[PDB]
């Protein structure tokens, strides 16, 4: 119905807010987050279905407006990750724009330029908030949803990682400067004697990461321990009640905890794990169980894996002199959604 939408507005004199700018329908549900206009049920359920879905490339996965899986025009800015759908542009901005755009060399999306309006596309007044605001109101089991952050108010990320050194990764992700001194990352291996007072003085935190030691057991400390200490420490790390809230935490397991000692973890962390596998074309090299508050991490789950598989997968590894090489690659991209909250450092 997209070809008709533009008529409806300049002809039947409707108010965009009355046509699902996604699929140009007339049976609206509740207005559209990002741009001026409404949303149909079938269309909304999808908007949700893919909110912070990113890809190896590093950009968002679906159309910023319609959630189309087709080809997408990407922003030319490095602060932006949003991508815009061919038809969407054309159908709402004006005809023959996706042309002009695929033409342009230095493009800046709609949620990036000075002028508020282009064609019929109208970037809401202060959307970012209205977005989350939507999330809550519209999903059926809302989760921790933190308002996003305009490119100019994005201070650097302050991280604390227990047992495992992330640096290398968040570095490659564009989260850390090149200056390895004020480096907002604190690593600490032993915390058995650490008190809430320490953590507090340790400078306030934005992200607390942490994870169990690998299969190549080098440190003798009952797995379940880590789960526990991590938990503790975290509360310390948290912020003084009522403060804004850009606050994220994650705990990872390389299949080192067992059924019991795990059903535990999930109770303390308050969320069923999210096992992420490493593919090799049919085979299965490694895997990783995860816990976190980071935007949509409960979508990158591969129910395509079975317990009885891992149990064995964890047999051919304790059967060699493998290196404690920690399976980074797995989560590296999980952190992507954050690019929308903290400062990014161009390489």
């Amino acid at each position: 119905g997209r070809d008709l939408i533009a008529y409806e507005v300049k002809a039947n004199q409707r108010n965009i807010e009355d046509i699902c700018i996604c699929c140009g329908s007339l049976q609206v549900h509740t207005q559209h987050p990002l741009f001026e206009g409404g949303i149909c049920a079938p269309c909304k359920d999808k908007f949700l279905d893919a909110l912070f879905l990113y890809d190896d490339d590093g950009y968002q996965s679906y159309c910023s407006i319609c959630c189309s899986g087709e080809t997408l025009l990407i922003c030319g800015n490095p602060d932006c990750t949003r991508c815009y759908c061919f038809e969407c542009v054309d159908s709402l901005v004006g005809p023959g724009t996706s042309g002009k755009v695929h033409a342009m060399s230095n493009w800046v999306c709609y949620l990036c330029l000075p002028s508020s309006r282009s064609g019929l596309l109208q970037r809401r007044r202060k959307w970012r908030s209205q977005l989350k605001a939507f999330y809550d109101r519209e999903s059926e089991n809302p989760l921790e949803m933190f308002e996003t952050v305009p490119v100019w108010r994005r201070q650097p990320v302050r991280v604390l990682s227990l047992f495992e050194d992330i640096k290398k990764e968040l570095t490659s992700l564009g989260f850390l400067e090149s200056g390895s001194d004020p480096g907002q990352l604190k690593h600490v291996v032993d915390v058995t004697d650490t008190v809430r007072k320490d953590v507090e003085e340790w400078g306030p935190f934005d992200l607390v990461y942490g994870a169990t030691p690998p299969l190549g057991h080098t440190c003798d400390r009952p797995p379940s321990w880590y789960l526990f200490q991590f938990h503790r420490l975290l509360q310390y790390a948290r912020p003084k009640p009522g403060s804004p809230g850009p606050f994220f935490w994650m705990f990872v397991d390389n299949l080192v905890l067992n059924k019991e000692d795990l059903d535990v973890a999930s109770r303390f962390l308050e969320m069923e794990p999210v096992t992420i596998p490493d593919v090799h074309g049919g085979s299965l090299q490694n895997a990783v169980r995860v816990w976190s508050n980071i935007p949509a991490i409960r979508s990158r789950h591969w129910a395509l894996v079975s317990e009885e598989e891992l149990s064995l997968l964890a047999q051919n590894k304790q059967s060699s002199k493998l290196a404690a090489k920690w399976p980074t690659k797995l989560v590296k991209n999980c952190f992507l959604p954050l690019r929308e909250y903290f400062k990014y450092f161009s390489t």
Binding site: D57, T71, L72, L73, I74
Partner: peptide, 7 residues
């Protein structure tokens, strides 16, 4: 612009 499509 720059293009891209994912599965």
């Amino acid at each position: 612009a720059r293009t891209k499509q994912t599965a």
